[PDB]
Amino acid sequence: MKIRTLELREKSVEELETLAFSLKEELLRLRQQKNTQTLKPHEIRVMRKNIARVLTVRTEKLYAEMYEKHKNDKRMPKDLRPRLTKAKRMALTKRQLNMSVHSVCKRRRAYPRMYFSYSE
Amino acid sequence: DTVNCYGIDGETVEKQLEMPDVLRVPIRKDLVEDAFRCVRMDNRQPYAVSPNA
Amino acid sequence: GSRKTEIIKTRLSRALVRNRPIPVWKRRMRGNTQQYNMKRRHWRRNKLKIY
Amino acid sequence: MKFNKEKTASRRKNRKAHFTANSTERRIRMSSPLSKELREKYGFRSFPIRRNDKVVVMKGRFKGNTGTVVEVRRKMYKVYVDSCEASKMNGRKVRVGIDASNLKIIELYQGDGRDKILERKMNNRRMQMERAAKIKME
Amino acid sequence: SKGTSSFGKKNKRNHILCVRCGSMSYHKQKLRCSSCGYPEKKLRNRGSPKARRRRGEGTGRMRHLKKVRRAARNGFKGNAILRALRNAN
RNA sequence: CACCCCGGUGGGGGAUCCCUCGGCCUGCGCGCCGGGCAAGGACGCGGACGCACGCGAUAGACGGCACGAUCCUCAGACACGACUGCCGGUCUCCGACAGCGGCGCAGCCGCAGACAACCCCCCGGACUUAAGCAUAUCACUAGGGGGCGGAGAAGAAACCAACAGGGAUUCCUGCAGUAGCGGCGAGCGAACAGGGACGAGCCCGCAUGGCAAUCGGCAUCGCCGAGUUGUGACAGCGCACCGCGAACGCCCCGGACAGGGCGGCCACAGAGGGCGACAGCCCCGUAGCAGCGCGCAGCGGAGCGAGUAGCGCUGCUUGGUCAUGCAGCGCGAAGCGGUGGUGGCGCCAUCGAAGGCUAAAUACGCCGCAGGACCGAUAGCGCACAAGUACCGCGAGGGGACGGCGACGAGCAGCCCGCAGGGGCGGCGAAAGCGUGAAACCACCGGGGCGCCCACUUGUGGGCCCCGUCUUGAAACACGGACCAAGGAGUG
RNA sequence: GUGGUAGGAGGGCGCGCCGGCGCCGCAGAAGCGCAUGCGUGCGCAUGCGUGGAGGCACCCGCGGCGCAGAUCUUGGUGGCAG
Ligand SMILES: [Mg+2]
Ligand SMILES: [Mg+2]
Ligand SMILES: [Mg+2]
Ligand SMILES: [Mg+2]
Ligand SMILES: [Mg+2]
Ligand SMILES: [Mg+2]
Ligand SMILES: [Mg+2]
Ligand SMILES: [Mg+2]
Ligand SMILES: [Mg+2]
Ligand SMILES: [Mg+2]
Ligand SMILES: [Mg+2]
Ligand SMILES: [Mg+2]
Ligand SMILES: [Mg+2]
Ligand SMILES: [Mg+2]
Ligand SMILES: [Mg+2]
Ligand SMILES: [Mg+2]
Ligand SMILES: [Mg+2]
Ligand SMILES: [Mg+2]
Ligand SMILES: [Mg+2]
Ligand SMILES: [Mg+2]
Ligand SMILES: [Mg+2]
Ligand SMILES: [Mg+2]
Ligand SMILES: [Mg+2]
Ligand SMILES: [Mg+2]
Ligand SMILES: [Mg+2]
Ligand SMILES: [Mg+2]
Ligand SMILES: [Mg+2]
Ligand SMILES: [Mg+2]
Ligand SMILES: [Mg+2]
Ligand SMILES: [Mg+2]
Ligand SMILES: [Mg+2]
Ligand SMILES: [Mg+2]
Ligand SMILES: [Mg+2]
Ligand SMILES: [Mg+2]
Ligand SMILES: [Mg+2]
Ligand SMILES: [Mg+2]
Ligand SMILES: [Mg+2]
Ligand SMILES: [Mg+2]
Ligand SMILES: [Mg+2]
Ligand SMILES: [Mg+2]
Ligand SMILES: [Mg+2]
Ligand SMILES: [Zn+2]
């Protein structure tokens, strides 16, 4: 947690792409020092994890950006649709299940639900 | 044979009831044991080994 | 046998790096009930099925 | 009796829940009673023990000793109090592990936001006592 | 002849690594795995009642299924970043 | 001297007992896979990392939120959030294509693969029972193939009935081990009722003709397409959902109090677990306490089902009997037809097939949860342990064994000897030193010499062949038995 | 009055657990070893040693309830055999 997420929200998506490449370089210099010399035990750990932290903030900013790009799209990208289940994505909608023929509409309209109470 | 009904004071007799005829029934100790044996195995839950075991 | 496919050598390398004792710092960990690696494999006694 | 069917009275599941408790639950299970001087201020019965807590030992060999908590270890459930020690052979003094139930907190540490956590339990206890007072009023 | 002498000639290896199931059961001549039946599309009908216990579903990592159990438990709310964006509009 | 027997000490081994983060069973809940790349696999990923488990090049905690001080073997990390929890990201590669299919289709989609308990469709045994056996039985099972779903299938009468008539399906009870089938042998074997659970009903087709009023797609209010070989209709949903929870002191014993004794206290809490012995009051807990909203609009209604029904033949099936069902083939309908335990014909009675949908009651494994007159490490799952692991098999596959110090605070290496393993004096601890430590067996020591029964003055006499078993008959030159522990067979 | 195979019957002993009921246990439970006693017998009780946390008796109820054998099963160990 050497690189904090608070600073990564300020950077842009392509600015996080360059940061992950720059942090990958420093990890290669750390893996050099681990082989040749000693290192503090979690230096490779920390630099590996803030590469992941930069890339996560990159992904989280990119999901937010791509959603507002293709929000009012006819077909949104599959990334931005909710991954329910293949069966649940192929389910009929509640509007489609409520679809009934004209005779069922007229009958429910002409004979609606009654609210009543009985007593003997 | 009349029984007292006590208050929560525990000493004052409030009513004096007659004994109900249930409590004057001569006890058949064998019959209460025979019924207790079958009543005890009303909540008897099953046990078995696994059929593959 | 000095001629092998890419899959054979990767499986042979994975069998080789696996075949090592418990690192000695693990014997000082609490709750470490393992004293020696019981899954050690010797090349003459135990065969690998890498064909 | 326990009338909640969804909680276990099972010994096996309660014992497994104790030894495979996670670290958040193991902190709660390592609670310790307060003194009466702390309970007049805070009100709650006990609180989870922490490092730098002043503690009087209530049971065991060190019973009646006072000292600060210098080490809590959640796995194996042991609180190590300053001035509750035993020597090794090489003269090295080791703190002796005491269960948290055998310790009573004399002075609560309040440094690392713990005064917030004490006041959160204190206020929720005070608020829940107000609801039970109104319900018994009605 | 029949026994100890004939075992010296057993230096062919007929069943090699299957690319689908990873057992050493893919035959070279037959070009079919004896365990899982690759390259048939459906899995081979397992030859024993215990073979499902060794090789079936749940005996592996269940990488997608453990995720979809966790999403189903929470109500399939899905991606946490996109969840707040659909909630705002 | 050896040998044998008995005891003591020490071995040997792991029985017993006590324990149990495990199993088993029952109930309930859930019932959610997949080109958005599944199941499964391969290969990689930890600072020191083999196994296990976790994970995917964002590779041994990446983000958000909650939590709030430790994690630990070393080194280190940590309020700029340790350890955690919940959810989400990332999620290599092999493994679902000679792909197949839908839609005018700039293109957009679907199918495949997994799951195999439950359910639906097809295929379909034999052992077995009949004291043989062939039909029968096992069994319309096992098994194989295909296919779904959270249930499925079924389902709104071409039904039951013969009454004073009932009224979808499914399930329960019951009819009923009955009618009946059956080398009428073995055996098999339903239905209507009556009672109940649960309840629910609907639709397409022959829709206007003063104009397809209908739909799909798009780069969208306009094109293009479908379509007259005929398109056409909205009543149901959603959110919220806590944190706190009462009450104990002294004395004794002890390594330690939860024990004993005395005295209290709380209880809508005396369920259970932890804590150095057995705790209502030490801890975790336990009893106890909290809801709501938003919706429903219109325009046809007599439409009707053919290579079918039925008949004939055949094969299968069924309790179904001069045919119950199903199929194939031949024949092939009607305006009235079907049916009436099932020969034909006639009556009378009762329904309307050959098109479609339909909740609930019903079934069920994994998994989650909760229980139990279950089992307690040779038991219980194969697995309480690095178990579908080690290991074996070319392969399909096969498949074990192994639990326990203590207050997880101490439990060491001081001195002498030995190259060393170690030994001896010591050391820690209440003790054990990975609980208890039976027997077989063994070492040494001590005592004694029938293998047993009887008798007594204990070494003599008298009596005794090896048990089990089958057998007319066993000491048998009948068979099984080296020893010991544990397990081990009339149950449901 | 007194034998007894196959066999039937009765009454008890013993084991795991149950509903009760009397109790016991760190001042030492079960288990185990050796003794003594009781008992026709199944078996029971005690003493001492060990052990270190549970157990006993009786009445009830449930039963996977009693072993010398099965070329029994599993484990251990002998003789053979230095
Ligand atoms: Mg080679
Ligand atoms: Mg070899
Ligand atoms: Mg050859
Ligand atoms: Mg060949
Ligand atoms: Mg001896
Ligand atoms: Mg054993
Ligand atoms: Mg279950
Ligand atoms: Mg994937
Ligand atoms: Mg993180
Ligand atoms: Mg399929
Ligand atoms: Mg059979
Ligand atoms: Mg026969
Ligand atoms: Mg026979
Ligand atoms: Mg025969
Ligand atoms: Mg499904
Ligand atoms: Mg259906
Ligand atoms: Mg039959
Ligand atoms: Mg129409
Ligand atoms: Mg409390
Ligand atoms: Mg026909
Ligand atoms: Mg008619
Ligand atoms: Mg009739
Ligand atoms: Mg119809
Ligand atoms: Mg044992
Ligand atoms: Mg076992
Ligand atoms: Mg062989
Ligand atoms: Mg021992
Ligand atoms: Mg005879
Ligand atoms: Mg003879
Ligand atoms: Mg004999
Ligand atoms: Mg002879
Ligand atoms: Mg023999
Ligand atoms: Mg036995
Ligand atoms: Mg006699
Ligand atoms: Mg007899
Ligand atoms: Mg007993
Ligand atoms: Mg007894
Ligand atoms: Mg038995
Ligand atoms: Mg025996
Ligand atoms: Mg015998
Ligand atoms: Mg031998
Ligand atoms: Zn394969």
Coordinates of all heavy atoms in Angstrom, one line a residue, chain F residues 50-51 65 72 114 137 146 170 203 251 274 285 288 311 314 319 380 407 413 435 443 449 452:
Chain F
rG50 P 9.3 -24.2 -4.0 OP1 10.8 -24.1 -4.0 OP2 8.5 -23.5 -5.0 O5' 8.9 -25.7 -4.0 C5' 7.7 -26.2 -3.5 C4' 7.8 -27.6 -3.0 O4' 8.5 -27.6 -1.7 C3' 6.5 -28.3 -2.8 O3' 6.0 -28.8 -4.0 C2' 6.9 -29.4 -1.8 O2' 7.7 -30.4 -2.5 C1' 7.9 -28.7 -0.9 N9 7.2 -28.0 0.2 C8 7.2 -26.7 0.5 N7 6.5 -26.4 1.6 C5 6.2 -27.6 2.1 C6 5.5 -28.0 3.2 O6 5.0 -27.2 4.1 N1 5.3 -29.3 3.4 C2 5.8 -30.2 2.5 N2 5.5 -31.5 2.8 N3 6.4 -30.0 1.4 C4 6.6 -28.7 1.3
rC51 P 4.4 -28.4 -4.3 OP1 4.2 -28.8 -5.7 OP2 4.2 -27.1 -3.8 O5' 3.6 -29.4 -3.4 C5' 3.9 -30.8 -3.3 C4' 3.3 -31.3 -2.0 O4' 3.9 -30.7 -0.9 C3' 1.8 -31.0 -1.8 O3' 1.1 -31.9 -2.6 C2' 1.6 -31.1 -0.3 O2' 1.6 -32.4 0.1 C1' 3.0 -30.6 0.2 N1 2.9 -29.2 0.6 C2 2.4 -28.9 1.9 O2 2.0 -29.8 2.6 N3 2.3 -27.6 2.3 C4 2.8 -26.7 1.5 N4 2.7 -25.4 2.0 C5 3.3 -26.9 0.3 C6 3.4 -28.2 -0.1
rC65 P -14.9 3.1 0.7 OP1 -15.2 4.5 0.8 OP2 -13.5 2.6 1.0 O5' -15.9 2.2 1.6 C5' -17.3 2.3 1.4 C4' -18.0 1.2 2.0 O4' -17.6 -0.1 1.3 C3' -17.7 0.9 3.5 O3' -18.3 1.7 4.4 C2' -18.1 -0.6 3.6 O2' -19.5 -0.7 3.7 C1' -17.6 -1.1 2.3 N1 -16.2 -1.7 2.4 C2 -16.1 -3.0 2.8 O2 -17.1 -3.7 3.1 N3 -14.9 -3.6 2.9 C4 -13.8 -2.9 2.6 N4 -12.6 -3.5 2.7 C5 -13.9 -1.6 2.1 C6 -15.1 -1.1 2.0
rC72 P -0.4 -15.6 13.3 OP1 -0.9 -16.9 12.7 OP2 -0.8 -15.2 14.6 O5' 1.2 -15.6 13.2 C5' 1.9 -15.9 12.0 C4' 3.3 -15.5 12.0 O4' 3.4 -14.1 12.3 C3' 4.2 -16.1 13.1 O3' 4.6 -17.4 12.8 C2' 5.3 -15.1 13.2 O2' 6.2 -15.3 12.1 C1' 4.6 -13.8 13.0 N1 4.3 -13.1 14.2 C2 5.3 -12.2 14.7 O2 6.3 -12.1 14.1 N3 5.1 -11.6 15.9 C4 3.9 -11.7 16.5 N4 3.7 -11.1 17.6 C5 2.9 -12.6 16.1 C6 3.1 -13.3 14.9
rA114 P -21.1 -33.0 -21.9 OP1 -20.6 -34.4 -21.7 OP2 -22.5 -32.8 -22.4 O5' -21.0 -32.3 -20.5 C5' -19.8 -32.2 -19.8 C4' -19.9 -31.3 -18.6 O4' -20.6 -30.1 -19.0 C3' -20.8 -31.9 -17.5 O3' -20.1 -32.7 -16.6 C2' -21.3 -30.6 -16.8 O2' -20.4 -30.1 -15.9 C1' -21.4 -29.6 -18.0 N9 -22.8 -29.6 -18.5 C8 -23.2 -30.1 -19.8 N7 -24.4 -29.9 -20.0 C5 -24.9 -29.4 -18.8 C6 -26.2 -29.0 -18.4 N6 -27.3 -29.1 -19.2 N1 -26.3 -28.4 -17.2 C2 -25.3 -28.3 -16.4 N3 -24.0 -28.6 -16.7 C4 -23.9 -29.2 -17.9
rU137 P -44.0 -61.4 -16.1 OP1 -44.9 -60.3 -15.7 OP2 -43.1 -61.2 -17.2 O5' -43.2 -61.8 -14.8 C5' -43.8 -62.0 -13.6 C4' -42.8 -62.6 -12.6 O4' -42.2 -63.8 -13.2 C3' -41.6 -61.8 -12.3 O3' -41.9 -60.8 -11.3 C2' -40.6 -62.8 -11.9 O2' -40.8 -63.2 -10.5 C1' -40.9 -63.9 -12.8 N1 -40.0 -64.0 -14.0 C2 -38.7 -64.4 -13.9 O2 -38.1 -64.7 -12.8 N3 -38.0 -64.5 -15.0 C4 -38.5 -64.3 -16.3 O4 -37.7 -64.4 -17.2 C5 -39.8 -63.9 -16.3 C6 -40.5 -63.8 -15.2
rG146 P -26.2 -39.3 -25.0 OP1 -25.1 -38.6 -25.6 OP2 -26.2 -39.6 -23.6 O5' -27.5 -38.4 -25.3 C5' -28.0 -38.3 -26.6 C4' -29.5 -37.9 -26.6 O4' -30.3 -39.0 -26.0 C3' -29.9 -36.7 -25.9 O3' -29.6 -35.5 -26.5 C2' -31.4 -36.9 -25.8 O2' -32.0 -36.7 -27.0 C1' -31.5 -38.4 -25.5 N9 -31.5 -38.6 -24.0 C8 -30.4 -39.1 -23.2 N7 -30.8 -39.1 -22.0 C5 -32.1 -38.7 -21.9 C6 -32.9 -38.5 -20.9 O6 -32.8 -38.7 -19.7 N1 -34.2 -38.1 -21.2 C2 -34.5 -37.8 -22.5 N2 -35.8 -37.3 -22.7 N3 -33.7 -37.9 -23.5 C4 -32.5 -38.4 -23.2
rU170 P -53.2 -37.3 -12.7 OP1 -52.4 -38.3 -13.4 OP2 -54.4 -37.7 -12.1 O5' -52.3 -36.6 -11.5 C5' -50.9 -36.2 -11.8 C4' -50.4 -35.5 -10.6 O4' -51.2 -34.3 -10.4 C3' -50.4 -36.2 -9.3 O3' -49.4 -37.2 -9.2 C2' -50.3 -35.1 -8.3 O2' -49.0 -34.6 -8.3 C1' -51.2 -34.0 -9.0 N1 -52.6 -34.1 -8.5 C2 -52.9 -33.5 -7.3 O2 -52.0 -32.9 -6.7 N3 -54.2 -33.5 -6.9 C4 -55.2 -34.1 -7.6 O4 -56.3 -34.1 -7.1 C5 -54.8 -34.7 -8.8 C6 -53.6 -34.7 -9.2
rC203 P -60.1 -17.8 -23.2 OP1 -60.5 -16.4 -23.4 OP2 -61.1 -18.9 -23.2 O5' -59.0 -18.1 -24.2 C5' -57.8 -17.3 -24.2 C4' -56.7 -18.0 -25.0 O4' -56.5 -19.3 -24.5 C3' -57.1 -18.2 -26.4 O3' -56.9 -16.9 -27.1 C2' -56.1 -19.3 -26.8 O2' -54.8 -18.7 -27.0 C1' -56.1 -20.1 -25.6 N1 -57.0 -21.3 -25.7 C2 -56.6 -22.4 -26.5 O2 -55.5 -22.4 -27.0 N3 -57.4 -23.5 -26.5 C4 -58.5 -23.5 -25.9 N4 -59.3 -24.5 -26.0 C5 -59.0 -22.4 -25.2 C6 -58.2 -21.3 -25.1
rC251 P -10.2 -15.3 51.2 OP1 -9.1 -14.8 51.9 OP2 -10.1 -15.5 49.7 O5' -10.6 -16.7 51.8 C5' -10.5 -16.9 53.2 C4' -11.1 -18.2 53.7 O4' -12.4 -18.4 53.1 C3' -10.3 -19.4 53.2 O3' -9.2 -19.8 53.9 C2' -11.4 -20.5 53.3 O2' -11.6 -20.9 54.6 C1' -12.7 -19.7 52.9 N1 -13.0 -19.8 51.4 C2 -13.6 -21.0 50.9 O2 -13.8 -22.0 51.7 N3 -13.9 -21.1 49.6 C4 -13.6 -20.1 48.8 N4 -13.9 -20.2 47.5 C5 -13.0 -18.9 49.3 C6 -12.8 -18.8 50.6
rG274 P -16.2 -26.3 25.6 OP1 -15.3 -27.3 25.1 OP2 -17.0 -26.5 26.8 O5' -15.5 -24.9 25.7 C5' -14.6 -24.5 24.7 C4' -14.2 -23.1 24.9 O4' -15.4 -22.3 25.3 C3' -13.2 -22.8 26.0 O3' -11.9 -23.0 25.6 C2' -13.5 -21.4 26.4 O2' -12.9 -20.5 25.5 C1' -15.0 -21.3 26.2 N9 -15.8 -21.5 27.4 C8 -16.6 -22.6 27.7 N7 -17.2 -22.5 28.9 C5 -16.7 -21.3 29.4 C6 -17.0 -20.7 30.6 O6 -17.8 -21.0 31.5 N1 -16.4 -19.4 30.7 C2 -15.5 -18.9 29.8 N2 -15.0 -17.7 30.1 N3 -15.3 -19.5 28.6 C4 -15.9 -20.7 28.5
rG285 P -21.2 -12.1 21.6 OP1 -21.1 -11.1 20.5 OP2 -21.7 -11.8 22.9 O5' -22.2 -13.3 21.0 C5' -23.5 -13.4 21.5 C4' -23.7 -14.9 21.9 O4' -23.0 -15.2 23.0 C3' -25.2 -15.2 22.2 O3' -26.0 -15.5 21.1 C2' -25.0 -16.4 23.1 O2' -24.7 -17.6 22.3 C1' -23.7 -16.1 23.9 N9 -24.0 -15.4 25.1 C8 -23.6 -14.2 25.4 N7 -23.9 -13.7 26.6 C5 -24.6 -14.8 27.1 C6 -25.3 -14.9 28.4 O6 -25.3 -14.1 29.3 N1 -25.9 -16.1 28.5 C2 -25.9 -17.1 27.6 N2 -26.6 -18.2 27.9 N3 -25.3 -17.0 26.4 C4 -24.7 -15.8 26.2
rG288 P -37.5 -14.7 23.1 OP1 -39.0 -14.9 22.9 OP2 -36.6 -15.0 22.0 O5' -37.4 -13.1 23.4 C5' -38.3 -12.5 24.3 C4' -37.8 -11.2 24.8 O4' -36.4 -11.3 25.1 C3' -37.8 -10.0 23.9 O3' -39.1 -9.4 23.9 C2' -36.8 -9.1 24.4 O2' -37.2 -8.3 25.5 C1' -35.7 -10.1 24.9 N9 -34.6 -10.3 24.0 C8 -34.4 -11.4 23.2 N7 -33.4 -11.3 22.5 C5 -32.8 -10.1 22.8 C6 -31.7 -9.4 22.3 O6 -30.8 -9.8 21.5 N1 -31.5 -8.2 22.9 C2 -32.3 -7.7 23.8 N2 -32.0 -6.4 24.2 N3 -33.4 -8.2 24.3 C4 -33.6 -9.4 23.7
rC311 P -61.8 -50.3 -33.6 OP1 -62.6 -50.9 -32.6 OP2 -60.4 -49.9 -33.3 O5' -61.8 -51.2 -34.9 C5' -63.0 -51.4 -35.6 C4' -62.7 -51.9 -37.0 O4' -62.1 -50.8 -37.8 C3' -61.7 -53.0 -37.1 O3' -62.2 -54.3 -36.8 C2' -61.2 -52.9 -38.6 O2' -62.2 -53.4 -39.4 C1' -61.2 -51.3 -38.7 N1 -59.9 -50.8 -38.5 C2 -59.0 -50.8 -39.6 O2 -59.3 -51.3 -40.6 N3 -57.7 -50.3 -39.4 C4 -57.4 -49.8 -38.2 N4 -56.2 -49.3 -38.1 C5 -58.3 -49.7 -37.1 C6 -59.5 -50.2 -37.3
rU314 P -52.3 -61.5 -36.6 OP1 -52.1 -62.9 -36.7 OP2 -53.2 -60.9 -35.7 O5' -50.8 -60.8 -36.4 C5' -49.8 -61.1 -37.3 C4' -48.7 -60.0 -37.1 O4' -49.2 -58.7 -37.4 C3' -48.1 -59.9 -35.8 O3' -47.1 -60.9 -35.5 C2' -47.5 -58.5 -35.8 O2' -46.3 -58.5 -36.5 C1' -48.5 -57.8 -36.6 N1 -49.5 -57.1 -35.8 C2 -49.2 -55.8 -35.3 O2 -48.1 -55.3 -35.5 N3 -50.1 -55.2 -34.5 C4 -51.3 -55.7 -34.2 O4 -52.1 -55.0 -33.5 C5 -51.6 -57.0 -34.8 C6 -50.7 -57.6 -35.5
rG319 P -49.3 -55.3 -15.0 OP1 -48.6 -54.8 -13.9 OP2 -48.7 -56.3 -15.9 O5' -50.7 -55.8 -14.6 C5' -50.9 -57.2 -14.4 C4' -52.4 -57.6 -14.3 O4' -53.0 -56.7 -13.4 C3' -53.1 -57.5 -15.6 O3' -53.0 -58.6 -16.4 C2' -54.5 -57.2 -15.1 O2' -55.1 -58.5 -14.8 C1' -54.3 -56.5 -13.8 N9 -54.5 -55.0 -14.0 C8 -53.4 -54.1 -13.9 N7 -53.8 -52.9 -14.0 C5 -55.1 -53.0 -14.3 C6 -56.1 -52.0 -14.6 O6 -55.9 -50.8 -14.7 N1 -57.3 -52.5 -14.8 C2 -57.7 -53.8 -14.8 N2 -58.9 -54.1 -15.0 N3 -56.8 -54.8 -14.5 C4 -55.6 -54.3 -14.3
rG380 P -19.4 -49.2 11.0 OP1 -20.7 -49.7 10.8 OP2 -18.3 -49.4 10.0 O5' -19.5 -47.6 11.1 C5' -20.7 -47.1 11.7 C4' -20.6 -45.6 11.7 O4' -19.3 -45.2 12.4 C3' -20.4 -44.9 10.4 O3' -21.6 -44.9 9.7 C2' -19.8 -43.6 10.7 O2' -20.8 -42.8 11.3 C1' -18.8 -44.0 11.8 N9 -17.5 -44.3 11.3 C8 -17.0 -45.5 11.0 N7 -15.8 -45.5 10.5 C5 -15.5 -44.1 10.5 C6 -14.3 -43.5 10.0 O6 -13.3 -44.0 9.6 N1 -14.4 -42.2 10.1 C2 -15.5 -41.5 10.6 N2 -15.4 -40.2 10.6 N3 -16.6 -42.1 11.0 C4 -16.5 -43.4 10.9
rA407 P -3.2 -28.4 31.3 OP1 -4.0 -28.9 32.5 OP2 -3.7 -28.6 29.9 O5' -3.0 -26.8 31.5 C5' -3.4 -25.9 30.5 C4' -2.8 -24.6 30.7 O4' -2.6 -24.5 32.1 C3' -1.5 -24.3 30.1 O3' -1.7 -23.7 28.8 C2' -0.8 -23.3 31.0 O2' -1.3 -22.0 30.8 C1' -1.3 -23.8 32.4 N9 -0.4 -24.7 33.1 C8 -0.5 -26.1 33.2 N7 0.4 -26.6 33.9 C5 1.2 -25.5 34.3 C6 2.3 -25.4 35.1 N6 3.0 -26.5 35.6 N1 2.9 -24.2 35.3 C2 2.2 -23.2 34.7 N3 1.2 -23.1 34.0 C4 0.7 -24.4 33.8
rA413 P 19.8 -25.4 25.6 OP1 19.7 -24.4 24.5 OP2 19.9 -26.9 25.2 O5' 20.9 -25.1 26.6 C5' 22.3 -25.5 26.3 C4' 22.9 -26.1 27.5 O4' 21.9 -27.1 28.1 C3' 24.1 -26.9 27.2 O3' 25.0 -26.9 28.4 C2' 23.6 -28.3 27.0 O2' 24.5 -29.4 27.2 C1' 22.5 -28.4 28.1 N9 21.5 -29.3 27.8 C8 20.5 -29.3 26.9 N7 19.7 -30.3 26.9 C5 20.2 -31.1 27.9 C6 19.8 -32.4 28.4 N6 18.8 -33.0 27.9 N1 20.6 -32.9 29.4 C2 21.6 -32.2 29.9 N3 22.1 -31.0 29.5 C4 21.3 -30.5 28.5
rG435 P 1.2 -39.5 24.2 OP1 2.4 -40.0 24.8 OP2 0.5 -40.1 23.0 O5' 0.1 -39.4 25.3 C5' 0.5 -39.1 26.6 C4' -0.7 -39.0 27.5 O4' -1.9 -38.7 26.8 C3' -1.1 -40.3 28.3 O3' -0.2 -40.6 29.4 C2' -2.5 -40.0 28.7 O2' -2.5 -39.0 29.7 C1' -3.0 -39.2 27.4 N9 -3.7 -40.2 26.5 C8 -3.3 -40.3 25.2 N7 -4.0 -41.2 24.6 C5 -5.0 -41.6 25.5 C6 -6.0 -42.5 25.4 O6 -6.3 -43.2 24.5 N1 -6.7 -42.6 26.6 C2 -6.4 -42.0 27.7 N2 -7.2 -42.2 28.8 N3 -5.5 -41.1 27.8 C4 -4.8 -41.0 26.7
rA443 P 14.1 -64.1 26.9 OP1 15.2 -64.9 26.4 OP2 13.1 -64.6 27.8 O5' 14.8 -62.8 27.6 C5' 15.8 -62.2 27.0 C4' 16.2 -61.0 27.8 O4' 15.2 -60.0 27.9 C3' 16.5 -61.2 29.3 O3' 17.8 -61.8 29.5 C2' 16.3 -59.8 29.9 O2' 17.4 -59.0 29.6 C1' 15.1 -59.4 29.1 N9 13.9 -59.7 29.8 C8 13.1 -60.7 29.5 N7 12.0 -60.8 30.3 C5 12.2 -59.8 31.1 C6 11.4 -59.3 32.2 N6 10.3 -59.9 32.5 N1 11.8 -58.3 32.9 C2 13.0 -57.7 32.5 N3 13.8 -58.0 31.5 C4 13.3 -59.1 30.9
rG449 P 9.3 -77.1 44.4 OP1 9.1 -78.0 45.6 OP2 10.7 -77.0 43.8 O5' 8.3 -77.6 43.3 C5' 8.8 -78.4 42.2 C4' 8.0 -78.3 41.0 O4' 8.4 -77.2 40.2 C3' 8.0 -79.6 40.1 O3' 6.8 -79.8 39.5 C2' 9.1 -79.2 39.1 O2' 8.9 -79.8 37.8 C1' 8.9 -77.7 39.0 N9 10.2 -77.0 38.7 C8 11.0 -76.5 39.7 N7 12.1 -76.0 39.2 C5 12.0 -76.1 37.9 C6 12.8 -75.8 36.8 O6 13.9 -75.2 36.9 N1 12.3 -76.1 35.6 C2 11.1 -76.8 35.4 N2 10.8 -77.0 34.1 N3 10.3 -77.1 36.3 C4 10.8 -76.8 37.5
rC452 P -1.7 -77.2 36.1 OP1 -1.9 -75.9 36.8 OP2 -0.9 -78.3 36.7 O5' -3.2 -77.8 36.0 C5' -4.2 -77.0 35.4 C4' -5.4 -77.9 35.1 O4' -5.1 -79.0 34.3 C3' -6.1 -78.5 36.3 O3' -6.9 -77.6 37.0 C2' -6.8 -79.7 35.7 O2' -8.0 -79.2 35.1 C1' -5.9 -80.1 34.6 N1 -5.0 -81.2 35.0 C2 -5.5 -82.5 35.1 O2 -6.6 -82.8 34.9 N3 -4.6 -83.5 35.5 C4 -3.4 -83.3 35.7 N4 -2.6 -84.3 36.1 C5 -2.8 -82.0 35.7 C6 -3.7 -81.0 35.3

